[PDB]
Amino acid sequence: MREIVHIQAGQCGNQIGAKFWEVISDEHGIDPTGSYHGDSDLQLERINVYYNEATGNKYVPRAILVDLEPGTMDSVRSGPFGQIFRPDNFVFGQSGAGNNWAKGHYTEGAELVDSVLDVVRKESESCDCLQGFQLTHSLGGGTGSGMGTLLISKIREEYPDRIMNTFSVMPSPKVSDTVVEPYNATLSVHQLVENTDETYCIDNEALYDICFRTLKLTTPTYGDLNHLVSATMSGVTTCLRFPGQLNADLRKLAVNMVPFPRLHFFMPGFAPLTSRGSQQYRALTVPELTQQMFDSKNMMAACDPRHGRYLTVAAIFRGRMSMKEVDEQMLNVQNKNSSYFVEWIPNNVKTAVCDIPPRGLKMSATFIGNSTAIQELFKRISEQFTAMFRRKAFLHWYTGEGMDEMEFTEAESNMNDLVSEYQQYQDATADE
Amino acid sequence: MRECISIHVGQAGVQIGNACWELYCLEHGIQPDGQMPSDKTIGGGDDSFNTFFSETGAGKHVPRAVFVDLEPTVIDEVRTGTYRQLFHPEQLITGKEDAANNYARGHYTIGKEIIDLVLDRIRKLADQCTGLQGFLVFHSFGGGTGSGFTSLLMERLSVDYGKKSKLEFSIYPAPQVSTAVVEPYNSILTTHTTLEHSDCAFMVDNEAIYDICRRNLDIERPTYTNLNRLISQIVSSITASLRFDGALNVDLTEFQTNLVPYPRIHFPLATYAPVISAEKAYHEQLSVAEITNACFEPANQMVKCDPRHGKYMACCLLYRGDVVPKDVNAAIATIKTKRSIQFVDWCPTGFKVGINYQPPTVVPGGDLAKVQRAVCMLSNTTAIAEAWARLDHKFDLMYAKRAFVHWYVGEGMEEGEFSEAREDMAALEKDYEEVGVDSV
Amino acid sequence: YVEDLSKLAVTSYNDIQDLMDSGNKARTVAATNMNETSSRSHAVFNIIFTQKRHDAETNITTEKVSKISLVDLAGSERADSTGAKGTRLKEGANINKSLTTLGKVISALAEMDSGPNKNKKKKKTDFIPYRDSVLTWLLRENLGGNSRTAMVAALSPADINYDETLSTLRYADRA
Ligand SMILES: CC(=O)O[C@H]1C(=O)[C@@]2(C)[C@H]([C@H](OC(=O)c3ccccc3)[C@]3(O)C[C@H](OC(=O)[C@H](O)[C@@H](NC(=O)c4ccccc4)c4ccccc4)C(C)=C1C3(C)C)[C@]1(OC(C)=O)CO[C@@H]1C[C@@H]2O
Ligand SMILES: Nc1nc2c(ncn2[C@@H]2O[C@H](COP(=O)(O)OP(=O)(O)OP(=O)(O)O)[C@@H](O)[C@H]2O)c(=O)[nH]1
Numbered sequence A: 001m002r003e004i005v006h007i008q009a010g011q012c013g014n015q016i017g018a019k020f021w022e023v024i025s026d027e028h029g030i031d032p033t034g035s036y037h038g039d040s041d042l043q044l045e046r047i048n049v050y051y052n053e054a055t056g057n058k059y060v061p062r063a064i065l066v067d068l069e070p071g072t073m074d075s076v077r078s079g080p081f082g083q084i085f086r087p088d089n090f091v092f093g094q095s096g097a098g099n100n101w102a103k104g105h106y107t108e109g110a111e112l113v114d115s116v117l118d119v120v121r122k123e124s125e126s127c128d129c130l131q132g133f134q135l136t137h138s139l140g141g142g143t144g145s146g147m148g149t150l151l152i153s154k155i156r157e158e159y160p161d162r163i164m165n166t167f168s169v170m171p172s173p174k175v176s177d178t179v180v181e182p183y184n185a186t187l188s189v190h191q192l193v194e195n196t197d198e199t200y201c202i203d204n205e206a207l208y209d210i211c212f213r214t215l216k217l218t219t220p221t222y223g224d225l226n227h228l229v230s231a232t233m234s235g236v237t238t239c240l241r242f243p244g245q246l247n248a249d250l251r252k253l254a255v256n257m258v259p260f261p262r263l264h265f266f267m268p269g270f271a272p273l274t275s276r277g278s279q280q281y282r283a284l285t286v287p288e289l290t291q292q293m294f295d296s297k298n299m300m301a302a303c304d305p306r307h308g309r310y311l312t313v314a315a316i317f318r319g320r321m322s323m324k325e326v327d328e329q330m331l332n333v334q335n336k337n338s339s340y341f342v343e344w345i346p347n348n349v350k351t352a353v354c355d356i357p358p359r360g361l362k363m364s365a366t367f368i369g370n371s372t373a374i375q376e377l378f379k380r381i382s383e384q385f386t387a388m389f390r391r392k393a394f395l396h397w398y399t400g401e402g403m404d405e406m407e408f409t410e411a412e413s414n415m416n417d418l419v420s421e422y423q424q425y426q427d428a429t430a431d432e
Numbered sequence B: 001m002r003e004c005i006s007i008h009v010g011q012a013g014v015q016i017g018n019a020c021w022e023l024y025c026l027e028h029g030i031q032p033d034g035q036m037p038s039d040k041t042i043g044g045g046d047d048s049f050n051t052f053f054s055e056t057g058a059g060k061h062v063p064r065a066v067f068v069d070l071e072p073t074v075i076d077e078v079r080t081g082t083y084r085q086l087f088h089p090e091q092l093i094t095g096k097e098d099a100a101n102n103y104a105r106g107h108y109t110i111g112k113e114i115i116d117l118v119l120d121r122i123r124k125l126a127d128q129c130t131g132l133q134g135f136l137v138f139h140s141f142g143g144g145t146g147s148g149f150t151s152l153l154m155e156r157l158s159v160d161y162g163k164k165s166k167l168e169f170s171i172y173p174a175p176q177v178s179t180a181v182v183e184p185y186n187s188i189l190t191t192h193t194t195l196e197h198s199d200c201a202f203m204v205d206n207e208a209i210y211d212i213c214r215r216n217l218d219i220e221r222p223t224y225t226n227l228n229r230l231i232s233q234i235v236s237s238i239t240a241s242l243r244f245d246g247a248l249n250v251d252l253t254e255f256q257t258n259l260v261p262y263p264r265i266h267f268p269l270a271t272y273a274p275v276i277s278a279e280k281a282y283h284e285q286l287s288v289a290e291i292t293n294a295c296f297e298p299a300n301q302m303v304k305c306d307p308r309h310g311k312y313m314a315c316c317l318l319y320r321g322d323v324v325p326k327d328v329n330a331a332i333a334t335i336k337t338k339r340s341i342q343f344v345d346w347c348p349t350g351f352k353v354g355i356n357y358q359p360p361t362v363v364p365g366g367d368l369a370k371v372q373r374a375v376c377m378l379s380n381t382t383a384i385a386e387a388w389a390r391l392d393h394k395f396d397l398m399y400a401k402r403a404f405v406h407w408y409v410g411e412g413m414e415e416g417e418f419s420e421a422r423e424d425m426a427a428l429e430k431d432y433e434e435v436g437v438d439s440v
Numbered sequence C: 001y002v003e004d005l006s007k008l009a010v011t012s013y014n015d016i017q018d019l020m021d022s023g024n025k026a027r028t029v030a031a032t033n034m035n036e037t038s039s040r041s042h043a044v045f046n047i048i049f050t051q052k053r054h055d056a057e058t059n060i061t062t063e064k065v066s067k068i069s070l071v072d073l074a075g076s077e078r079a080d081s082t083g084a085k086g087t088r089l090k091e092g093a094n095i096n097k098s099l100t101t102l103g104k105v106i107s108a109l110a111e112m113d114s115g116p117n118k119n120k121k122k123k124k125t126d127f128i129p130y131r132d133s134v135l136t137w138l139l140r141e142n143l144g145g146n147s148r149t150a151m152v153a154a155l156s157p158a159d160i161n162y163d164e165t166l167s168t169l170r171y172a173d174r175a
């Protein structure tokens, strides 16, 4: 029985995880107190993917909460679903990292990593057949990035055969909230490229653009961003929980999407999104979902796919629909946009179909792309990195905690090598 | 006694098996819970025929089947569905993750630790059986389980039983549409299994059946249920001769004899003629000549390959219903008269004919109309190689750069094996021409 | 480079011979059907040599520094003939991975150093996947760049091994 251990780090990861546990909990029908009050018989069939079973017919999510500032933990406990989590999994300390990756990875997090790994081992030992992990955190921050990278390294050291997923929120061109985001982002990306099987890219700029242009909201908050992201996470792993005409495990996505080991940075997307005003106009059907999934403005990474090529894509549909229509639409998308797909991967579109849609919708779809345009994002960070590293803008904070220029240099070189490895396949006309 | 054992592997195999067992239960008047009211209603005869069902003491009938899959989901659907009380509880789920579109996972690492249990169940079923005729294996290329575990199972079955026939019904990848990126690797790596161990393998294509549904049955949005029902009709037409009386009956051995000119050539195509909707069932005679001609139409082939680009080497027609030898003789003469259908120089005989009295049934809630006559044509021809060639090209496009190879190599497979499979396939492609050449 | 690598000073042939014996003892070796002493890990033996010329007027001390690198790679395996199961299988898988990437690098390198040299001289851009494995990463300067390198290929005369043996020759033909 496949099931997932869940880890949350930092403020962004903690909040996204809280919202995610509210969404999954609806689909499966779980009371905030922990009891089950569903209506369908298929909600409890595979509930063990996320939830352990307690004595009194309760269900406890298999989540791990990590931070160095206690305050966020309180915000989780004093909330709509604060009592659902078991208190033993609230692992935290004091004197947070303060947006310093060195404190998160080397000085402060090195003490709390033992306790976090203890709780992770305790959860993973009880697993019937542990599939893999998934971590939510922010690369541009402090405790989140550092402790996420450290935990990822330790877990890959101890569990080499299991899947290691990751949902990362990285910096943006215009949206910036810390002065030292490039250093943290560069070091985090250097750590992630080695020790991770899948990494979904999320950008606040793309989510705000979706909210303003697609959903037409006027005053979006972080709740809406968490809503979209949690919808994506629930969309990714639908097939482990519910039956379908053609299933798609996590390993199937990993195999079909990753041509070479270092190219595992994905662009996610979700459909439909209708703004609550145009819901009565559009007809809902497979062609509409196909059109919305591949639209450039619907992506969550703020990287235009038209500036590169799609190495691979995966489409996970939820709902009762015909397979012939899905296959025809995917073939049409391949054929019409002939110049945005690579010429040495015939039929580079993975397809999955699940028969149980979300509770309020007749149809839905999730899109996981893998394209060269992601290089742009890395290039941007690299540019900013140089602009601070050449003069050593803030390096004394990092070197005071037990680092040196050599780690910065090797991280920058690794990032540049990854950026070069994407471009290779980016240009057309492989001959000269 | 006449009987054959059905094995279903993977999601495609399990769903085709669901359709097949629905059709069999409807045909023989067996209720979903295994009881047969006809036994008490009539008090005689033989309705729970032993070709597919075994009767216990209490009157229950249990099918002779072995479902296998690495995912628990697809068979857990069966274990809690309409037919939960029919099958034996031994359903052989591997309580782990799945092959993940990898030959290596389903053949080397995870395919083992479940193969022994499957062979034990097959041994029990064979011991129950008297005068076993063969195995009907349902699987699918492209999928990791349907490829790797099929290879393991066929190897072990050939080692153990050897002389019993083994027929495949497999879903070859389509030329254009597909549901995975690593389909060509999985499909190519099954060449050794499908060539050396299988005695006669039937291939079907999703695109061809979609076109058949769109054109004939006027179904604009078909799903896999229709495909499974059509394939079930094919299999039932093939195996009908072991169950019901007929003017000319054709069992599996004599069936194989008149369809394999050489050992390395056992890859025929299959077609079902009277695929027609209920509304279009009127306005048409549906005589023997019409269905015989429709069997030879390129548009109705179940695999995307044109018979007009090659030569027919053997044909076996299996008729059901109100059919008489005069009409089939006339139809065969008319087909021989046509010049578009080219037969090889070294097979003057051409056709094998079998006739059965039991007409095809109609599943409730289905799409095929009730008909008085039907025919299934199985043709060994040279055109199939063209389809293979297309797939081979795709394989090359992914192997020149070693894309996705590390996933296979990390689970025990060696690199050169890839190359090896390709030459093996190439050798097959050279034998399915060197035979079509006119003699001198 | 490899951080915290015990670089031992030696002065005589007997001492380095003792180091060699200890190192060969310390390696990981396991028995399989193909060989009773099948190696389970790649090995790199490095000798750092320093040549000094002393003069109080003009000459420069430490005239030359050289690195002698002898590399013994675990060979590719096939699960059917090897008969591996469990750990012996998993190890082999890693070995095969560490070889497959290496082959790509060799092929990649060859084409580039064939192309720019023979084609025109464009030198636009060519990516070599050095980072896909630690073996290719550590030998970045050895397979290409700042060193003089020799490749010794081992063959098997057995007829049954033909389909494998030829493969080696092909890469050797590109080496
Ligand atoms: C159809 C209808 O009458 O109401 C819809 C609705 O109007 C729309 C606009 C909904 C609505 O979504 C939003 O307004 C929204 C706002 C900010 C961020 C994200 C969404 C909806 O709020 C969202 C809500 O979604 C669900 O109920 C899904 O099951 C969703 N779960 C949750 O939203 C949820 C939130 C908190 C607690 C429990 C469940 C889900 C989505 C993916 C995967 C799993 C679950 C639905 C259907 C609707 C409303 C209520 C208007 C849409 O959202 C989703 C995810 O369905 C917007 O795009 C769709 C299109 C829908 O038509
Ligand atoms: N005709 C038909 N084809 C199917 C059906 N289900 C799946 N397929 C085909 O099977 C291919 C791969 O699915 P499977 O071979 O069943 O994969 P699997 O057996 O579940 O093995 P895994 O890869 O480990 O999941 C797809 O490309 C489909 O085209 C079906 O119900 N009918």
Ligand SMILES: Nc1nc2c(ncn2[C@@H]2O[C@H](COP(=O)(O)OP(=O)(O)O)[C@@H](O)[C@H]2O)c(=O)[nH]1
Binding pocket: A009, A010, A011, A012, A013, A015, A016, A097, A098, A099, A138, A140, A141, A142, A143, A144, A145, A169, A176, A177, A178, A204, A222, A223, A225, A226
């Ligand atoms: N999507 C989303 N992003 C957030 C949220 N809170 C913070 N962020 C992002 O995270 C970055 C700050 O990282 P932070 O959470 O402080 O890292 P930490 O200090 O290690 O916990 C900012 O650039 C924000 O864009 C949130 O609720 N939702």
Ligand SMILES: [Mg+2]
Binding pocket: A247, B010, B011, B071, B098, B143, B145
């Ligand atoms: Mg499967």
